């Protein structure tokens, strides 16, 4: 990609990464607020099942 | 184990040994009040039987 105005791939990359850091921030803050490492099934399914059984 | 906030295993250890010590204290104080080593059958049941016969 040469010099142009209609497109900006760097802007896409940056925001893609930013949103990645944002989801990381949100999950870390959720874990800190709840005090639990597995609050739902998407964290660890087997871990969630074994913790529920315990 | 690492640093966490929801579970306090050391507190549970302390509570368990505290209740054990409290039960021992209550048993000793009951024995001192009654003047009898055997008050129920949970303390030397056969001893209770032979002492009752005596």
Swiss-Prot record, chains A, B:
Signal peptide: none annotated. It is found in: Secreted; Bacterial flagellum. Heteromer of multiple flagellin subunits including FlaA, FlaB, FlaC, FlaD and FlaE. Belongs to the bacterial flagellin family. Flagellin is the subunit protein which polymerizes to form the filaments of bacterial flagella. FlaD is not essential for flagellar synthesis and motility. V.cholerae is able to differentially regulate the flagellins within the flagellum maybe to produce flagella which are particularly suited for motility within a given environment. This is Flagellin D.
């Amino acid at each position: 990609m040469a010099v142009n105005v209609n497109t900006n791939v760097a802007a896409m990359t940056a925001q893609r990464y930013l949103t990645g850091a944002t989801n990381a921030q949100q999950t870390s803050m959720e874990r800190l607020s709840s005090g639990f490492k597995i609050n739902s099934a998407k964290d660890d399914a087997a871990g969630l099942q074994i913790s529920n059984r315990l």
